[PDB]
Amino acid sequence: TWTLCEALWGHLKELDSQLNEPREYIQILERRRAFSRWLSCTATPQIEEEVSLKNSPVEAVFSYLTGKRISEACSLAQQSGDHRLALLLSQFVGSQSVRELLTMQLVDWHQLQAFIQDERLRIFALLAGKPVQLSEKQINVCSQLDWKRS
Amino acid sequence: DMIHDAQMDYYGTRLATCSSDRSVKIFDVRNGGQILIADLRGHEGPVWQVAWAHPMYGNILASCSYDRKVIIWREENGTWEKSHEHAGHDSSVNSVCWAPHDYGLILACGSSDGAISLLTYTGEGQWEVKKINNAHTIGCNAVSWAPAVVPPSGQKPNYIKRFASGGCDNLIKLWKEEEDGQWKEEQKLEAHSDWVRDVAWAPSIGLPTSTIASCSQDGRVFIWTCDDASSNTWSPKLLHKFNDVVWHVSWSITANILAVSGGDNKVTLWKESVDGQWVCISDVN
Amino acid sequence: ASMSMFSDFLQSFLKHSSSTVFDLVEEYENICGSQVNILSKIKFSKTASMLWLLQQEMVTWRLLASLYRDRIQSAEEESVVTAVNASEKTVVEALFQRDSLVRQSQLVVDWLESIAKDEIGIEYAKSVYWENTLHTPLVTELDPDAPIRQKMPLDDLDREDEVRLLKYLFTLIRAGMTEEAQRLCKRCGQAWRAATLEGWKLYHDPNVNGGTELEPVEGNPYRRIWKISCWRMAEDELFNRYERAIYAALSGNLKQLLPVCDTWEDTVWAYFRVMVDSLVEQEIQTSVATLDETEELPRLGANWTLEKVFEELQATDLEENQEHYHIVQKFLILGDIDGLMDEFSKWLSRNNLPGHLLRFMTHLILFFRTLGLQTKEEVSIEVLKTYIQLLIREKHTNLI
């Protein structure tokens, strides 16, 4: 509790000198970085346990993402033969507007798409940028994973 | 026990072989005496055909097999190691052949799943494949290259790059590397009543009247002909029919003598007479 | 009246005496281009040969103007200061400004792309992607990975349409028609393919990267991973011949199936692209911009020099390299232009066989000295002398 409270609350110092205004920008990234990293620590046993049981190639690639490890997921995707997905995965951690195209893909799919893998869609939901506030929600996931994980 | 195909090296020095025991043996024939030199083992299934690349690329030899994989064995000072391996087809690979040395170092392989891969050599140990899916209906057995034919500057001509190929559908489809890059079936040849066994693109004695021979389960041997360059006309002519299958067909270099292997464990030679009818010059063995 | 061509080139000179230097080459481009048209539209089959030579001349002048403008016009601008925090995108920008040598390669690339052939847009496009396979239900999963994942499901018809699409997008990419490429990808219904194209840009944040403050942040931060992923993807067979080619280009690698019909310019293009792609990444690595995690696969780190680029390209495409004007193009790119001018002059003492070449060198030398006092006086006279003599033979003494 104290540690998390610190990461959020305690002031973060930036050693490097900078122009100025972007400092706030940089500082947030640092804080965000630490905070997200910490959450991964708590989630880690939970996630890893789940991956060990998963009987699929694709679901874990999803699971790694929950882990906040893009690279491993990308690698797994490469190994799994899911080459195309792998490239898209690298986009993650990219706030890029790629989200819109992706949402479009999801929209097109859920307007016909007799078939898409459940998990593949989940990955797309993630790149969309609004995972739980969009239609093709991972809200249902809420029962499955830790609130923290989500 | 029983060998399948065995082909002499260019410059007539070596003699690679392969039999159903999955062993690719390279013998050496200096003075008429056979002398093994290596037993390249590596196929999960019997080896089918085998071909020697052009000495211009060092000393290479490729062998395909029922293991659905094809192997290319280089040589560096006696170092007969395999520099590359290809497993792009799902079913066995009935045949291989090399493209005329000018096109480069291209290798054609016809599988039994009905496909055809085309391994092209680049700078290093990199081999890009140009696959053609569903080339023949039930699979492919033969693959032969069309003789390298040259079409105001010092360039290296863009060849027609054709290569025929028989299969289990009875059709002997010809092929052509379209200007863009991929291969398309320029034409079909349906004269056989059963599986086409082998198809050999006779070498042009500089002569433009390109020919091609084929033999199939029906036990007939056709020598398909083209009367002129650029006219999509292949008029088959019957060489002969035996009551038993014909397994292989090869062209002798100068005369254009056909070695007809098949039927009664016997092999025959044929030369087209000054009359046009083909005759048997003799019985081997 | 095409005979009056000499008039156009010389005609430009007239105005130049009255006015400024750079436009002259620019007009040389325009003039030869116009000529290319006349011989081109309607004519004896013989003209076609002469025609292309003119087109090439047009290209050569354009390349000519482009390179010199950059080289000569160059007025040293302020340096750029970056910081570790700055994004990779800024670093790339800096690399381009600082490395004139590399940037020049870019200038050449822009030129190559400019003259790139594009097929006419795929006509009766299918309403939706893989409709046939969906119709003939076999597709458990729509995604593109499904066929990679498993064997024989795609319909032949679908595979055929992909062959047209991926061939067209590819030509577009070579052209540099990236936006159109994206446009097609979206409209075609291949959103996924479109996404990969987006990967091209590096990550820039206007907030942190002050120098080029845009409004939204754009680009992907893990470019290296994207690059490799694309590279790995390209290698994976069971993909389109033109599809794998595009990834190869994106990766900054080479292809084989497509380069069979690769011409000199196109081949020059592909190779330079490799040089650039490699150069940027090494620079990024030195900067420690990349993260170790990203380095999933190995990449060909070494970069050849431009000189080697031409030399090697010269070996595979010896026809177009042996071209009289084309040698000049390469010559300009290397920058040793003057060397050939003097060299060529010695041939006059089979240059004479080509009509254009003698004229070409002359206008070119004249242009050089004006922009920069350059070529040897001796060469100028010898050239001008020979050229004037042709003018008399031509009977157009008037302008001499």
Sign of CA dihedral C298, C304, C310, C311: negative
Chain C contacts of A23, Cβ < 8 Å? none
Q: Rounded CA gap, A48 and A50, in Å?
A: 5
Q: Rounded CA gap, C134 and C126, in Å?
A: 13
- Chain A, chain C: beta-carbon pairs less than 8 Å apart: 130
Would you call A27 helix, strand, or coil by DSSP?
helix
Q: Rounded CA gap, A79 and A75, in Å?
A: 6
Residue B132: DSSP 8-state: B
DSSP B66-95: TTS-EEEE--SSS---EEEEE---SS---E
Tokens representing C343 are 């060299």
Within its chain, how far is the Cα of C390 from the centroid? 35
The Cβ-side half-sphere exposure at B175, using a 13 Å CA radius, reads: 28
Q: How was this structure determined?
A: cryo-EM
Q: Rounded CA gap, C194 and C215, in Å?
A: 22
Q: Which residues sit opposite B222 in a β-bridge?
A: B214, B238
Alpha helices (H) in chain C, listed in sequence order = 5-18, 22-41, 45-73, 88-98, 100-114, 131-135, 145-149, 156-175, 178-188, 191-198, 223-235, 241-251, 264-286, 306-316, 318-321, 324-334, 338-347, 355-371, 377-394
Tokens representing C103 are 């940037």
Phi, psi of B14 (to 5 degrees): -105, -175
Within its chain, how far is the Cα of C178 from the centroid? 13
Cβ partners under 8 Å of residue C132, min gap 6: C155, C157, C158
- The answer to whether B104 and B118 are in contact (CB under 8 A) is no
Q: Which residues sit opposite B223 in a β-bridge?
A: B213
Q: Rounded CA gap, B109 and B119, in Å?
A: 8
**C25-42 b/e (C-beta count within 10 Å ≥ 16 → b):** bbbbbbbbbebbeebeee
Instruction: Report which of C113, C107, C126, C8 is spatially closest to residue C66, judged by C-alpha positions.
Output: C107
- The answer to whether B258 and B269 are in contact (CB under 8 A) is yes
Radius of gyration of chain A (CA): 17
- The answer to whether C53 and C356 are in contact (CB under 8 A) is yes
Q: Rounded CA gap, C139 and C145, in Å?
A: 11
**Using CA atoms in the order C287, C288, C294, C299, what is the torsion angle rounded to 10 degrees?**
50
Q: Rounded CA gap, B277 and B250, in Å?
A: 18
Q: Rounded CA gap, C214 and C360, in Å?
A: 45
Q: State the DSSP H helix or E strand holding residue B98, giving kind and residue range, or none if neither.
A: strand B95-98
Would you call B24 helix, strand, or coil by DSSP?
strand
Residue B54: DSSP 8-state: P
Chain B contacts of C261, Cβ < 8 Å? 179-181
**Using CA atoms in the order C11, C12, C16, C22, what is the torsion angle rounded to 10 degrees?**
-170
**Using CA atoms in the order A14, A15, A20, A25, what is the torsion angle rounded to 10 degrees?**
-30
Would you call B240 helix, strand, or coil by DSSP?
strand
Angle between helices C324-334 and C45-73 (to 10 degrees): 10
Distances (CA, A) of A122 to A130, A135, C284: 11, 12, 33
**For chain C, after which residues does the C atom lie more than 2.5 Å from the next written residue's N, i.e. where is it broken?**
42, 75, 80, 121, 123, 136, 349
Q: Rounded CA gap, C181 and C176, in Å?
A: 9
- The answer to whether C249 and C273 are in contact (CB under 8 A) is yes
The answer to whether A87 contacts C145, with C-beta atoms less than 8 Å apart, is no
Within its chain, how far is the Cα of C143 from the centroid? 33
Q: Rounded CA gap, C152 and B115, in Å?
A: 12
DSSP C324-341: HHHHHHHHHHHS--HHHH
Instruction: Report which of C109, C12, C120, C127 is spatially closest to residue C66, judged by C-alpha positions.
Output: C109
Instruction: Report which of C374, C283, C256, C355 is spatially closest to residue C98, judged by C-alpha positions.
Output: C283
Which of B90, B130, B179 is closest, CB to CB, to C257?
Answer: B130
Distances (CA, A) of C102 to A93, C271, C277, C306: 30, 14, 11, 9
Q: Which chains touch B (3 or more CB pairs under 8 A)?
A: C
The answer to whether B128 contacts C319, with C-beta atoms less than 8 Å apart, is no
Distance from CA of B103 to the nearest CA of C (A): 10
Angle between helices A58-67 and A118-128 (to 10 degrees): 30
The answer to whether C261 contacts B90, with C-beta atoms less than 8 Å apart, is no
Distances (CA, A) of B217 to A149, B168, C192: 66, 10, 49
Within its chain, how far is the Cα of B16 from the centroid? 15
Q: State the DSSP H helix or E strand holding residue B35, giving kind and residue range, or none if neither.
A: strand B34-41
Tokens representing B101 are 């040395």
Which of C163, C241, C318 is closest, CB to CB, to B155?
Answer: C318
Q: State the DSSP H helix or E strand holding residue A72, giving kind and residue range, or none if neither.
A: helix A70-80
Touch of C by A (3+ CB pairs closer than 8 Å): yes
Q: Rounded CA gap, A110 and A104, in Å?
A: 10
Phi-psi region of C291 (alpha: psi -120 to 50; beta: other; left: phi over 0): beta
Q: Does A20 touch chain C (CB under 8 A)?
A: no
Angle between helices C45-73 and C100-114 (to 10 degrees): 150
Would you call B141 helix, strand, or coil by DSSP?
coil
Resolution in angstroms, to 1 decimal, for this deposition?
Answer: 23.0
Q: Which chains touch A (3 or more CB pairs under 8 A)?
A: C
Instruction: Report which of B173, B175, B143 is spatially closest to residue B160, judged by C-alpha positions.
Output: B175
- Chain B, chain C: beta-carbon pairs less than 8 Å apart: 45
The CB density around residue A140, as the number of other CB atoms within 10 Å, is 8
The full set of domain ranges for chain B reads: 1-282
Q: Which residues sit opposite B145 in a β-bridge?
A: B163
Tokens representing C339 are 């060397």
